[model samples]
Target: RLLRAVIMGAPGSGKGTVSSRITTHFELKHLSSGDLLRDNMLRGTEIGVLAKAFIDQGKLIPDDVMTRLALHELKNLTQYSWLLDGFPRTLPQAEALDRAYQIDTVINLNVPFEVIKQRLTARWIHPASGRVYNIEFNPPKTVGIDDLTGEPLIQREDDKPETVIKRLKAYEDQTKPVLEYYQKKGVLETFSGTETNKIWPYVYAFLQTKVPQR
Candidate 1:
């Protein structure tokens, strides 16, 4: 009874937080596309090497290449239920994924653009350790410093105001069709709110029926 799922959201929409809860509470394997690419590249795997080429060129990886990379990792986890994040950014990729795994659900987080803009621009991270801090919601004890290591925090290029706006527009333009694809398939569930904490209960209740407790 594998329950394959995907979580989609704009940047700074808290997909990472909600995905963590789902993976923890539901006992599903978490498969993150960003992490997968990083791990593969770190190990110099075939797919990783191929993905790195386009990544270094500042271009989107071709649909087939990205799909093959994701599917390769997924093939090893067929025995267990899983939650996928950060892959299938386009309609073709969604169709490609469907060919291999019958996705049980797609969770779309609909946070307002202004809310995401504020959150992303105020966000800072420990680049070395990837520890994130939000100025308004979770600032560190020392401003612009990591709590544990005392290293300087950095606002990544993607977190800059202009960059965030560009990325959000790109995401909205690209993802609408994919959302429609899942909606047509009758497996898309949308949760709308500005705050993850407030919206999570609804998502939690919805998933209770889809995934059995361990």
Candidate 2:
């Protein structure tokens, strides 16, 4: 039997960390839409070239294009159980994906908006290395400096509180119906928490019942 799952969370909601845990614990292949796009673009694949054109124009890729890209990669992984991260961002996309795989689980993370705001505002990154640090949590050895390169860190425009709010609001509007759609299929599960470490145990326990022990 093939098991497929999708994990959803707002920015700064620990989606990456949780997805990693699930993949490691369940011995499942991890498929991430963002990573796939980057790989394609880096390798200059046809799909990558097409997707980059829209991205370079500051426009969203067409829904069918993204759906086709994901399904193509997914079909290649026919032998493995997999967990998807950061795809099907809208109801239409979810419906598009549902035509292919019968997703066995959907994990939605709910973190306080205030907490997410604070987290984003405190974040600083090293552009050259993509190293991220936060003032309150995981601060760098020096104030406003990358720990490895001794370079100044910058706060991305999207990390600004105002920008984060707008992004979150947009995500909510686009994702609510997708979440509802999965819930109606009896596979959606929601977890609320402020920290990844605190939330990991619950996610791990829930997945224990969903996947057979290896």
Candidate 3:
């Protein structure tokens, strides 16, 4: 069928978790800009060198560059229904995305900024595998080690407490208009809460109405 969607959330609002679940249950390809660029870094692809420098400093990539990157990656998923995450972080990017494609829905996760600060500060990720765990909630069995790969986890520079504050502030200011943009189009669906566990079921049922899971 035809399902093109975008997911938006504060950095620590469990967008990855919800994206994973939606893709798993709905037969949609998950296209996360963050993961797509991370692949570049790990593979040392054409953009990896530059991306490494950008992310290591806890900064967002330039608007035109990131939008180009998102559109390029999305073009490959044209054969399949796709769920996008972390791509349109700004109003410009969102408008650019519209020029290329029509999105049926835009999912916005709403976790309070205070809650996001707490969750992200304790969050660590397996860099290579991109697996996320939170010490405050879902810690690894072996502390600091990735369960499957035995690789050590890292708190991304952007995940530090100070960085989380700044990021949340940026998310609010930058994406609020994107939300309004989609809201006017009648495509914005917001799920608010402190935990994905509760938020997910509603999202699941909402999506269940749109597409069938295999």
The best candidate in terms of lDDT: 1
**lDDT (tens digit, per residue) of candidate 2 on 13-91:** 8888998888778867889998999899999999999999998897777889989999999988979887888788888
Model 2, position 113, has a per-residue lDDT of 83
Largest TM-score belongs to which candidate? Answer: 2
User: Order of all candidates by lDDT, from best down to worst?
Assistant: 1, 2, 3
Runs with alpha carbons beyond 4 Å of true place in candidate 3: 122-161
Root-mean-square deviation per candidate = 4.5, 3.8, 6.2
lDDT of 1 by residue, 81-191 (tens): 888998888989999999998998999999999998998799899988899998998999999999999999999887888898898889988898999999999999999
- Candidate 2, poorest ten consecutive residues by summed lDDT: 205-214
The collision pairs in model 1 are none
Please estimate how well model 2 matches the true structure, expressed as its whole-model Cα lDDT.
0.88
Evaluation by lDDT, superior candidate among 2 and 3: 2
Q: Per-candidate TM vs. native?
A: 0.84, 0.85, 0.79
What's the residue-level lDDT of 108 in candidate 3?
93
Candidate 3, residues 102-147, lDDT tens digits: the string is 9988999988988888877998999888899988879899998999
- Judged by whole-model lDDT over C-alpha atoms, candidate 3 comes out at 0.87
Candidate 3: 10-residue stretch with minimal lDDT: 158-167
